[PDB]
Write a protein that binds this ligand. Structure first.
Ligand SMILES: CCCCCCCCCCCCCCCCCC(=O)O
Length: 131
């Protein structure tokens, strides 16, 4: 887990609109989100990880242990059952609600953090650089 820790800033985004549309996010929220560049902070205290996502529009914070389910309320106000695991060196976050699922996968490639978001047929790639 240790290579993920730190402060990251968004530098590139592809197909986030498609992703948000698939989740049912309304057009006005999609407008603002398309212009927002969040900062993600990942910290550890023992076995507990904390993931903070900060922006001018909305802020979220979750704390969790790897491999243990937790309740999460997402930025778009879904109430989901989540689990985060390490798989092939990737941090894989699975959210389940109402029989649906979405995955948020983070991988480090060339020192950058690549976040891939999948729901239905929509696939979004967001690139973060370390601050
Ligand atoms: C918390 C602020 C991050 C982006 C805010 C705008 C988006 C809110 C509506 C869509 C939310 C979809 C789930 C969260 C996607 C996370 C993206 C990211 O960490 O880069």
């Amino acid at each position: 887990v240790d290579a993920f820790l730190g402060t990251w800033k968004l530098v590139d985004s592809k197909n986030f609109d498609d992703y948000m549309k698939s989740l049912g996010v309304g057009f006005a929220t999609r407008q603002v989100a398309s212009m927002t560049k969040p900062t993600t902070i990942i910290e550890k205290n023992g076995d507990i990880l904390t993931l903070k996502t900060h922006s001018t529009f909305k802020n979220t914070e979750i704390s969790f242990k790897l491999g243990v389910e937790f309740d999460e309320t997402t930025a778009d106000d879904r109430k989901v059952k989540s689990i985060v695991t390490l798989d092939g060196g990737k941090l894989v976050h699975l959210q389940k609600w109402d029989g649906q699922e979405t995955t948020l996968v983070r991988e480090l490639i060339d020192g950058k953090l690549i976040l891939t978001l999948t729901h239905g047929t929509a696939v979004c790639t967001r690139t973060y650089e370390k601050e």
